[PDB]
């Protein structure tokens, strides 16, 4: 648990699991805190640390829903670190799951993916 990251979710912030040995970062829920960097600051640090050295792949598994503007900026900061490591030859990957009946989550995930050149999957589910 020492190198890991386990953050419980609330009504306005997502639940987050950083599995250091598996190289997996997972998030679920809505995200609309007033200061998203009080939440995402440690997630960005965790990603930067994972990506600074080594060659182990890092995959992001997202089940995020509504993100406010501050969370979208923080999310963009995370994807900028993925893209930088990917341009340097680091294998990174992202999967964004969403309920097929709500196309806004797929549309948001797609806007993020247009600024990324690493493997980025958007997967619809029949709830």
83 lines the binding site for another protein (CB under 8 A): no
Q: How many CB atoms are located within 10 Å of the residue 19 CB?
A: 15
Q: Which two tokens stand for residue 126?
A: 């029949």
**CB of residue 87 to another protein, shortest distance in Å:** 17
32 lines the binding site for another protein (CB under 8 A): yes
**CB of residue 56 to another protein, shortest distance in Å:** 29
Using CA atoms, how far residue 43 sits from 14, 16, 107, in Å, is 12, 8, 23
Q: Which two tokens stand for residue 82?
A: 């993925």
Give the interface with another protein as residue ranges (CB under 8 A).
Answer: 11-12, 32, 34, 65-66, 68-70, 72-73, 76, 99, 101-105, 111, 115
């Amino acid at each position: 648990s020492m190198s890991d990251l386990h953050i419980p979710g609330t009504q306005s912030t997502p639940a987050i699991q950083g599995d250091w040995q598996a190289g997996r970062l997972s998030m679920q829920g809505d995200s609309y805190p007033e200061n998203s960097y009080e939440l995402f600051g440690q997630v960005i640090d965790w990603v930067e640390r994972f990506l600074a050295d080594g060659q182990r792949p890092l995959e992001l598994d997202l089940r995020l829903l509504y993100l406010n503007t501050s969370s979208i900026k923080a999310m963009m900061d995370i994807l900028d670190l993925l893209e930088e490591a990917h341009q340097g030859g680091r294998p990174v990957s992202l999967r964004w799951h969403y309920d097929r009946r709500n196309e806004r989550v797929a549309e948001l995930a797609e806007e993020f993916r247009e600024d990324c050149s690493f493997p980025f999957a958007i997967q619809a589910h029949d709830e």
